[PDB]
RNA sequence: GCGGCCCGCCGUAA
RNA sequence: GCUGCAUGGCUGUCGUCAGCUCGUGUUGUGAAAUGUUGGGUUAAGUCCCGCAACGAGCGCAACCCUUAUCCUUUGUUGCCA
RNA sequence: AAGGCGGCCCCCUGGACGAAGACUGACGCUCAGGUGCGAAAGCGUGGGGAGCAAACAGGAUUAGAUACCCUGGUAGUCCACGCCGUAAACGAUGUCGACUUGGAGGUUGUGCCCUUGAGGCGUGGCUUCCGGAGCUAACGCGUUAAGUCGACCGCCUGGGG
RNA sequence: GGGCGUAAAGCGCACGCAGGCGGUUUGUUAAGUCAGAUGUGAAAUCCCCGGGCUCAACCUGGGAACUGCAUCUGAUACUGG
């Protein structure tokens, strides 16, 4: 908008040449992103997400970078959506049928957990069951109670999470990644240029999306 | 020769004996011989029936025989005339008086002996062995079991070396003593020699 | 409704510490008889398993082509690793005269009159790509007219 | 851093 | 009586060595690969961490027998404070 | 141009590049037959000869050892003037010209700006290493193409013989 | 309507005669090229439309074809002078 609440690219030697249209003049040894062509398509993407949420699209959030972790887990579970926070497993979409069993095991174990040591006092087994529950909840916490095959994905870092992008392209699901100067627009994507590691930037990104999605239901 | 007999290794833990009686040195040999004779004669006679297991117990001055089967009607007949003939013949074989009992097999697709000789009977009618093996495995898995393994070995039509095949899915742990494994074998004589068949069934782990 | 064809099956080996282990591969083609067709390739230890595994693989992979009364108006050629394929429209009354897997592909596609011919190497797996080779890179009149910013009647004339 | 030590009859699993 | 080079059944050995595979998903035109590799550990593909892989099966370990310590019950044909 | 060229100094001599300006006006590209230049070894005539060293002679090692190892050692290696015309003479890639996303260096010129300083902007030539599309049987090549094109020339047609 | 980095295949490297190929306007020529026309290109054979032998092989009527060559008239965008 006008606060310029987003930083810009990394360096002029780590850059994908496909981003020439989106680039501005680089001055301080680093690339500068043209903000004059970031507002309109951002608003278009927001409208698209609004109409999808009005269609109960079950949006999905990703972006594991140790920075967006808590941010995306707060933006999710806020309106009506799900999220992925750690260690995107290869095949959550192309091999969802196998991940269903892991979800079922997690459901069983969380039901058993609330009365865990009552069933048996052999402390070794209780300890290892709790340890494996902890090991299992981090990779499936945000997706446990979702139907399956979401209708939209929002990605924070494009090149860093290319596995999810490839899976989405294979399945045929629209995606809404954010592309920096060292990434490239490859899939069918509503492209949002701008920095992706600045906390203010990512917060500004997710606030509008969360508000739009929560409005879309009503 | 690598595998220990699955039934023998478990006789003291989770499996019962087939013959149960007490005797001393002077009667051991003849007791065993009489048991062998009666078991062989009964197995020969009831070939057309569905006989699974024969249990022989010796009351003090008598012999008690129980037969497990899946079609008790044929063995027991219209009236009890056939069982009377069998009792007369058995009391002939062993001098002591005899009494006959009949058991019932609820799920014939279990109790591997019946599956084994069913497959052999199918093989005698010149049918493809793969169909028979798959049929039996699918039936056993459908009726409810945590594991099954079948195998056939011998001259399967070709002149080359006797080929061996086997199918298995589920769990068939052989190194656990707690497991309830039911195992039996059979053989079929064809125009190209004999064919061996072995079956393992995992009814369920026992605490 | 879907029509399926089986092209070829062959035995494949692999060496291990104890000897050699064998496996089979199956190549099948599937089409709707109207202009949509796909192919699949599967591997297994027993022949029926590979046969069934190729089928749904072909089913999920489908493309559509636009024909015209049983052919189109493009003498087209397609190339792959070592295969050259030439196909051209036939007037009428003729059939699907073609050597190997091209016959099955053009039959399931929905074509009834063609004058195909194959050059180069002729192993089945690469020549089956005749689908991807030229079938979908064919242009109908209306699409050309729309792309060139013109009308169909004067595109033909 | 460096002493030496050669050969293996003919065909032959689906 | 002949044929273990027409067979079933039953044995020896590598070797009580720690390995051997499968389903689904991806990569390659294909034979195939991935998982089973990488860091640290263990008697061990025994375990944690990382990782386009996610899980399973036969194996390993445990359930079996005997020996080493105590406590109840019973006390002859066994024992004697 | 290729074969190739390394102490220092003098004499004779060829080519390439950059900056600015002037001049002639298609005067160009390729090239069968022809001509010239080609490492090392080798040949002829005349010199020279320290080191090294085919041939050769001894000592070992070995079942044998016309070899590898040790002690010697002639032609040759050097100079002048003539022959020879072959090499894994290899980037195993013929010569010209045009077009097509990028990074990290080396070397040698030149313009501007505070020319402050080892500074900052450009702009030519020649060379190393990664890598995109594309091409390829694959390996790989990738603005110094094995990518997209044009002109001319030289070669190939199963393995042995 | 094929190839020459490793499968067979780029001369060891240059100079250069005969040959092959030419950056851009302007003006002429109509050699190449293009359009008509005329004369030729035997008959038989092939093809097409027909006809007659009881049908068919077989015979026959008419037409296209004979891709060419020469001559005349015209066109001037592209090669050549």
PDB file of C-alpha atoms in Angstrom, chain B residues 3-154:
ATOM      1  CA  UNK B   3      12.446 -75.426  10.031  1.00  0.00           C
ATOM      2  CA  UNK B   4      11.329 -77.009  13.286  1.00  0.00           C
ATOM      3  CA  UNK B   5       7.859 -78.532  13.210  1.00  0.00           C
ATOM      4  CA  UNK B   6       5.496 -75.742  14.340  1.00  0.00           C
ATOM      5  CA  UNK B   7       3.122 -78.066  16.172  1.00  0.00           C
ATOM      6  CA  UNK B   8       5.760 -80.038  18.054  1.00  0.00           C
ATOM      7  CA  UNK B   9       7.561 -77.061  19.582  1.00  0.00           C
ATOM      8  CA  UNK B  10       4.353 -75.817  21.250  1.00  0.00           C
ATOM      9  CA  UNK B  11       3.003 -79.040  22.773  1.00  0.00           C
ATOM     10  CA  UNK B  12       3.730 -77.920  26.319  1.00  0.00           C
ATOM     11  CA  UNK B  13       2.722 -74.277  26.094  1.00  0.00           C
ATOM     12  CA  UNK B  14      -0.408 -73.572  24.071  1.00  0.00           C
ATOM     13  CA  UNK B  15      -1.210 -76.867  22.398  1.00  0.00           C
ATOM     14  CA  UNK B  16      -2.807 -80.092  23.663  1.00  0.00           C
ATOM     15  CA  UNK B  17      -1.888 -83.658  22.842  1.00  0.00           C
ATOM     16  CA  UNK B  18      -4.043 -85.838  20.623  1.00  0.00           C
ATOM     17  CA  UNK B  19      -3.717 -89.014  22.713  1.00  0.00           C
ATOM     18  CA  UNK B  20      -4.123 -88.741  26.484  1.00  0.00           C
ATOM     19  CA  UNK B  21      -3.750 -91.750  28.778  1.00  0.00           C
ATOM     20  CA  UNK B  22      -1.395 -93.218  31.356  1.00  0.00           C
ATOM     21  CA  UNK B  23       0.425 -96.520  30.971  1.00  0.00           C
ATOM     22  CA  UNK B  24       3.565 -98.341  32.072  1.00  0.00           C
ATOM     23  CA  UNK B  25       6.413 -99.970  30.182  1.00  0.00           C
ATOM     24  CA  UNK B  26       4.573-103.262  29.688  1.00  0.00           C
ATOM     25  CA  UNK B  27       1.697-101.682  27.738  1.00  0.00           C
ATOM     26  CA  UNK B  28       3.259 -98.673  25.985  1.00  0.00           C
ATOM     27  CA  UNK B  29       4.071-100.435  22.716  1.00  0.00           C
ATOM     28  CA  UNK B  30       0.726-102.172  22.294  1.00  0.00           C
ATOM     29  CA  UNK B  31      -1.195 -99.047  23.300  1.00  0.00           C
ATOM     30  CA  UNK B  32       0.632 -97.098  20.603  1.00  0.00           C
ATOM     31  CA  UNK B  33       0.063 -99.858  18.060  1.00  0.00           C
ATOM     32  CA  UNK B  34      -3.676-100.057  18.746  1.00  0.00           C
ATOM     33  CA  UNK B  35      -3.977 -96.271  18.532  1.00  0.00           C
ATOM     34  CA  UNK B  36      -2.155 -96.309  15.198  1.00  0.00           C
ATOM     35  CA  UNK B  37      -4.425 -99.042  13.842  1.00  0.00           C
ATOM     36  CA  UNK B  38      -7.670 -97.365  14.865  1.00  0.00           C
ATOM     37  CA  UNK B  39      -6.581 -93.931  13.639  1.00  0.00           C
ATOM     38  CA  UNK B  40      -5.509 -95.282  10.257  1.00  0.00           C
ATOM     39  CA  UNK B  41      -8.709 -97.287   9.821  1.00  0.00           C
ATOM     40  CA  UNK B  42     -10.907 -94.322  10.735  1.00  0.00           C
ATOM     41  CA  UNK B  43      -8.987 -92.014   8.404  1.00  0.00           C
ATOM     42  CA  UNK B  44      -9.400 -94.515   5.571  1.00  0.00           C
ATOM     43  CA  UNK B  45     -13.107 -95.087   6.184  1.00  0.00           C
ATOM     44  CA  UNK B  46     -14.225 -91.453   6.524  1.00  0.00           C
ATOM     45  CA  UNK B  47     -12.277 -90.204   3.501  1.00  0.00           C
ATOM     46  CA  UNK B  48     -15.461 -88.994   1.811  1.00  0.00           C
ATOM     47  CA  UNK B  49     -16.438 -87.121   4.989  1.00  0.00           C
ATOM     48  CA  UNK B  50     -14.645 -84.029   6.333  1.00  0.00           C
ATOM     49  CA  UNK B  51     -12.488 -85.335   9.189  1.00  0.00           C
ATOM     50  CA  UNK B  52     -10.029 -82.979  10.872  1.00  0.00           C
ATOM     51  CA  UNK B  53      -8.738 -84.393  14.155  1.00  0.00           C
ATOM     52  CA  UNK B  54      -8.992 -87.687  16.042  1.00  0.00           C
ATOM     53  CA  UNK B  55      -8.549 -87.695  19.822  1.00  0.00           C
ATOM     54  CA  UNK B  56      -8.063 -90.989  21.662  1.00  0.00           C
ATOM     55  CA  UNK B  57      -8.419 -91.242  25.431  1.00  0.00           C
ATOM     56  CA  UNK B  58      -8.247 -94.436  27.479  1.00  0.00           C
ATOM     57  CA  UNK B  59     -10.620 -94.774  30.424  1.00  0.00           C
ATOM     58  CA  UNK B  60      -9.485 -97.532  32.742  1.00  0.00           C
ATOM     59  CA  UNK B  61     -11.096-100.500  30.995  1.00  0.00           C
ATOM     60  CA  UNK B  62     -12.192 -98.810  27.748  1.00  0.00           C
ATOM     61  CA  UNK B  63     -11.185 -96.560  24.856  1.00  0.00           C
ATOM     62  CA  UNK B  64     -12.861 -93.242  24.038  1.00  0.00           C
ATOM     63  CA  UNK B  65     -12.706 -91.739  20.544  1.00  0.00           C
ATOM     64  CA  UNK B  66     -13.838 -88.256  19.510  1.00  0.00           C
ATOM     65  CA  UNK B  67     -13.942 -87.179  15.863  1.00  0.00           C
ATOM     66  CA  UNK B  68     -13.890 -83.552  14.771  1.00  0.00           C
ATOM     67  CA  UNK B  69     -15.756 -82.948  11.530  1.00  0.00           C
ATOM     68  CA  UNK B  70     -17.511 -80.281   9.488  1.00  0.00           C
ATOM     69  CA  UNK B  71     -20.346 -82.449   8.091  1.00  0.00           C
ATOM     70  CA  UNK B  72     -21.554 -84.466  11.094  1.00  0.00           C
ATOM     71  CA  UNK B  73     -24.698 -85.530   9.246  1.00  0.00           C
ATOM     72  CA  UNK B  74     -22.921 -87.861   6.837  1.00  0.00           C
ATOM     73  CA  UNK B  75     -20.797 -89.413   9.588  1.00  0.00           C
ATOM     74  CA  UNK B  76     -23.838 -89.867  11.824  1.00  0.00           C
ATOM     75  CA  UNK B  77     -26.206 -90.988   9.053  1.00  0.00           C
ATOM     76  CA  UNK B  78     -29.988 -91.041   8.990  1.00  0.00           C
ATOM     77  CA  UNK B  79     -30.081 -93.013  12.230  1.00  0.00           C
ATOM     78  CA  UNK B  80     -27.113 -94.043  14.330  1.00  0.00           C
ATOM     79  CA  UNK B  81     -26.526 -97.214  12.328  1.00  0.00           C
ATOM     80  CA  UNK B  82     -23.224 -96.118  10.779  1.00  0.00           C
ATOM     81  CA  UNK B  83     -21.803 -95.009  14.119  1.00  0.00           C
ATOM     82  CA  UNK B  84     -22.912 -98.383  15.488  1.00  0.00           C
ATOM     83  CA  UNK B  85     -20.975-100.187  12.755  1.00  0.00           C
ATOM     84  CA  UNK B  86     -17.935 -98.017  13.445  1.00  0.00           C
ATOM     85  CA  UNK B  87     -18.178 -98.691  17.175  1.00  0.00           C
ATOM     86  CA  UNK B  88     -18.397-102.434  16.541  1.00  0.00           C
ATOM     87  CA  UNK B  89     -15.348-102.361  14.270  1.00  0.00           C
ATOM     88  CA  UNK B  90     -13.324-100.233  16.696  1.00  0.00           C
ATOM     89  CA  UNK B  91     -14.214-102.510  19.608  1.00  0.00           C
ATOM     90  CA  UNK B  92     -12.983-105.314  17.362  1.00  0.00           C
ATOM     91  CA  UNK B  93      -9.664-103.553  16.722  1.00  0.00           C
ATOM     92  CA  UNK B  94      -9.044-102.795  20.405  1.00  0.00           C
ATOM     93  CA  UNK B  95     -10.230-105.461  22.816  1.00  0.00           C
ATOM     94  CA  UNK B  96     -11.589-103.031  25.411  1.00  0.00           C
ATOM     95  CA  UNK B  97     -15.099-101.623  24.847  1.00  0.00           C
ATOM     96  CA  UNK B  98     -15.306 -98.391  22.882  1.00  0.00           C
ATOM     97  CA  UNK B  99     -17.545 -95.326  22.788  1.00  0.00           C
ATOM     98  CA  UNK B 100     -17.684 -92.877  19.880  1.00  0.00           C
ATOM     99  CA  UNK B 101     -18.198 -89.112  19.957  1.00  0.00           C
ATOM    100  CA  UNK B 102     -18.794 -86.532  17.234  1.00  0.00           C
ATOM    101  CA  UNK B 103     -17.549 -82.940  17.208  1.00  0.00           C
ATOM    102  CA  UNK B 104     -18.535 -79.991  15.030  1.00  0.00           C
ATOM    103  CA  UNK B 105     -16.272 -77.710  12.991  1.00  0.00           C
ATOM    104  CA  UNK B 106     -17.818 -74.256  12.758  1.00  0.00           C
ATOM    105  CA  UNK B 107     -15.481 -72.641  10.190  1.00  0.00           C
ATOM    106  CA  UNK B 108     -14.050 -75.237   7.779  1.00  0.00           C
ATOM    107  CA  UNK B 109     -11.946 -72.548   6.077  1.00  0.00           C
ATOM    108  CA  UNK B 110      -9.782 -72.565   9.210  1.00  0.00           C
ATOM    109  CA  UNK B 111      -8.127 -75.729  10.598  1.00  0.00           C
ATOM    110  CA  UNK B 112      -5.472 -76.017   7.904  1.00  0.00           C
ATOM    111  CA  UNK B 113      -5.846 -79.794   7.478  1.00  0.00           C
ATOM    112  CA  UNK B 114      -9.171 -79.333   5.674  1.00  0.00           C
ATOM    113  CA  UNK B 115      -7.771 -76.552   3.492  1.00  0.00           C
ATOM    114  CA  UNK B 116      -4.753 -78.682   2.597  1.00  0.00           C
ATOM    115  CA  UNK B 117      -6.620 -81.763   1.483  1.00  0.00           C
ATOM    116  CA  UNK B 118      -9.194 -79.579  -0.285  1.00  0.00           C
ATOM    117  CA  UNK B 119      -6.373 -78.102  -2.362  1.00  0.00           C
ATOM    118  CA  UNK B 120      -4.998 -81.579  -3.039  1.00  0.00           C
ATOM    119  CA  UNK B 121      -8.427 -82.762  -4.187  1.00  0.00           C
ATOM    120  CA  UNK B 122      -8.640 -79.782  -6.530  1.00  0.00           C
ATOM    121  CA  UNK B 123      -5.194 -80.627  -7.902  1.00  0.00           C
ATOM    122  CA  UNK B 124      -6.298 -84.190  -8.636  1.00  0.00           C
ATOM    123  CA  UNK B 125      -8.979 -82.858 -11.013  1.00  0.00           C
ATOM    124  CA  UNK B 126      -6.316 -81.165 -13.194  1.00  0.00           C
ATOM    125  CA  UNK B 127      -6.926 -77.531 -12.271  1.00  0.00           C
ATOM    126  CA  UNK B 128      -4.384 -74.722 -12.289  1.00  0.00           C
ATOM    127  CA  UNK B 129      -2.708 -74.617  -8.892  1.00  0.00           C
ATOM    128  CA  UNK B 130      -2.454 -70.826  -8.720  1.00  0.00           C
ATOM    129  CA  UNK B 131      -6.236 -70.452  -8.808  1.00  0.00           C
ATOM    130  CA  UNK B 132      -6.637 -72.943  -5.962  1.00  0.00           C
ATOM    131  CA  UNK B 133      -4.019 -71.265  -3.781  1.00  0.00           C
ATOM    132  CA  UNK B 134      -5.457 -67.791  -4.333  1.00  0.00           C
ATOM    133  CA  UNK B 135      -8.985 -69.056  -3.704  1.00  0.00           C
ATOM    134  CA  UNK B 136      -8.050 -70.639  -0.381  1.00  0.00           C
ATOM    135  CA  UNK B 137      -6.035 -67.620   0.755  1.00  0.00           C
ATOM    136  CA  UNK B 138      -8.846 -65.204  -0.092  1.00  0.00           C
ATOM    137  CA  UNK B 139     -11.450 -67.343   1.678  1.00  0.00           C
ATOM    138  CA  UNK B 140      -9.348 -67.636   4.825  1.00  0.00           C
ATOM    139  CA  UNK B 141      -8.633 -63.907   4.880  1.00  0.00           C
ATOM    140  CA  UNK B 142     -12.314 -63.150   4.323  1.00  0.00           C
ATOM    141  CA  UNK B 143     -13.538 -65.297   7.211  1.00  0.00           C
ATOM    142  CA  UNK B 144     -11.179 -63.480   9.585  1.00  0.00           C
ATOM    143  CA  UNK B 145      -7.573 -64.349  10.385  1.00  0.00           C
ATOM    144  CA  UNK B 146      -4.422 -62.364  11.017  1.00  0.00           C
ATOM    145  CA  UNK B 147      -2.279 -64.469   8.690  1.00  0.00           C
ATOM    146  CA  UNK B 148      -2.009 -67.442   6.354  1.00  0.00           C
ATOM    147  CA  UNK B 149       0.717 -69.001   4.227  1.00  0.00           C
ATOM    148  CA  UNK B 150       0.334 -71.780   1.663  1.00  0.00           C
ATOM    149  CA  UNK B 151       2.886 -73.527  -0.518  1.00  0.00           C
ATOM    150  CA  UNK B 152       3.038 -76.212  -3.195  1.00  0.00           C
ATOM    151  CA  UNK B 153       6.107 -78.132  -4.320  1.00  0.00           C
ATOM    152  CA  UNK B 154       6.753 -80.783  -6.915  1.00  0.00           C
TER     153      UNK B 154
END
